[PDB]
C-alpha cells in the first residue's frame, strides 16, 4: 500500500503544481491585467492589491 500510497501522492502531487503553476500564471497576468487596468486607471488600485 504505502508503495502505492505516496507513489500516487507524488504524481497527484505533480498534478498539483501543474495546476497551481498554471494557476499562478492565471493570477500572474491576472495581476498584470490589474496593473495595466490600474496603470491606465480604468480600474482601482485596490484590485491590484
Amino acid at each position: 500500500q504505502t508503495v502505492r500510497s505516496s507513489f500516487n501522492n507524488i504524481n497527484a502531487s505533480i498534478s498539483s503544481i501543474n495546476a497551481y503553476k498554471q494557476a499562478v500564471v492565471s493570477a500572474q497576468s491576472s495581476l498584470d491585467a490589474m496593473e495595466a487596468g490600474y496603470s491606465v486607471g480604468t480600474r482601482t488600485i485596490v484590485d491590484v492589491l
Binding site: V40, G41, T44
Partner: protein
C-alpha cells in the same frame, strides 16, 4: 476619490463626463426655457421704437 483607492480614473471620468454631459442638456432646456419665455413675455408691446401710438 480621485487618486485615492476606488475612484478608478476612467470610471471617474465617466461621471465628470456626465456632469459635463447633462449640464449641456441643462444648456438646452434653459435655451428652450429661454426660448419659450421669449415667446411668452414676448406679448407684446413695444416694438423697437418709442413714440406716438
Amino acid at each position: 476619490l480621485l487618486g485615492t483607492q476606488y475612484i478608478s480614473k476612467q470610471e471617474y471620468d465617466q461621471a465628470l463626463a456626465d456632469a459635463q454631459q447633462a449640464n449641456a442638456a441643462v444648456t438646452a432646456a434653459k435655451a428652450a426655457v429661454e426660448t419659450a419665455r421669449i415667446n411668452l413675455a414676448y406679448t407684446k408691446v413695444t416694438s423697437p421704437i418709442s413714440g406716438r401710438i
